[PDB]
């Protein structure tokens, strides 16, 4: 019973690969948006798995709740023609696709380690074998969670980035009105 839930990170990785392939592959882009929603669900799962369910719910309410909604909103209102995934059109990409897959994945796994010899830089990235010990301390007296600390640092130690995000959101209001609306005089 113990290890029935061991491979639930690997399953999410597998499902993410699948949903990305379906995004690239779907005929109608509405289906691509739905598979993007499924990928957000998978990411939210993984975030619960590693202990960040607050971010899972934030993702569900922001990404799926607003951004995906707006995507569906625009494809319901705009004519977006599509060419179907074809072998007479896309098979030319296979050599470069495979070369780039190998190169980009291997470099993305090599970039995280500080070892000098290049082959060892990948071999340390795949060195996920030994478990972490979780010991318990008694020093945290309060009920501070991740959201509380985000608020604390964002409103005290990092107040400037919040008061700059305010202007970013002002752009988010003022740009679309300038671009979409036509002012009479």
């Amino acid at each position: 019973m113990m290890y029935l839930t061991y491979y639930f990170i690997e399953i999410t990785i597998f499902l993410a690969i699948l949903c990305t392939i379906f995004i690239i592959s779907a005929k109608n882009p509405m289906v691509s948006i739905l598979y993007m929603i499924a990928l957000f669900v998978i990411a939210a799962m993984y975030l619960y798995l590693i202990g960040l369910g607050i971010f899972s719910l934030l993702y569900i309410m922001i990404y799926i709740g607003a951004i995906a909604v707006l995507f569906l909103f625009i494809i319901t209102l705009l004519d977006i023609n599509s060419t179907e995934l074809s072998v007479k059109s896309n098979i030319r990409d296979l050599p470069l696709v495979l070369i780039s897959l190998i190169v980009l994945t291997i470099s993305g796994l090599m970039i995280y380690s500080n070892d000098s010899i290049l082959i060892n830089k990948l071999l340390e990235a795949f060195g996920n074998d030994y478990n972490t010990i979780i010991t318990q301390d008694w020093f945290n007296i309060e009920n501070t969670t991740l959201l509380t600390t985000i608020g604390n640092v964002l409103l005290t130690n990092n107040a400037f980035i919040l008061l700059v995000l305010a202007i970013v959101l002002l752009l988010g209001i003022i740009g679309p009105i300038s671009i979409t609306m036509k002012h009479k005089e």
């Binding site: 478990n131 972490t132 010991t135 008694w138 945290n140």
Partner: protein
């Protein structure tokens, strides 16, 4: 109130949700052993509950008021070995 025939469905809704809450209170208490539920529990209370499970014989929320622990409490300590996150 006059129209009882209109209040009968409201009475059924009321009775069903009331009985559900009551049965759920009873089942929660049976699960806990004669004690109301805990709620709004933080890290501290979780660690203290695990400590209680170490001091009683795994008997849930049973409390102990003695001043010296059994000599099993010295060797009953748990560390958790976590999967590598990837």
């Amino acid at each position: 109130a006059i129209p009882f025939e209109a209040l009968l469905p409201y009475g059924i809704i009321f009775g069903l949700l009331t009985a559900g809450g009551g049965a759920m209170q009873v089942l929660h208490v049976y699960r806990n052993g004669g004690v109301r539920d805990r709620f709004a529990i933080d890290q501290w209370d979780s660690q203290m509950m695990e400590r209680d499970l170490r001091l009683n014989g795994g008997q849930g929320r049973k409390q102990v008021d003695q001043a010296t622990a059994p000599e099993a409490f010295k060797h009953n300590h748990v560390w958790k070995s976590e999967r590598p996150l990837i």
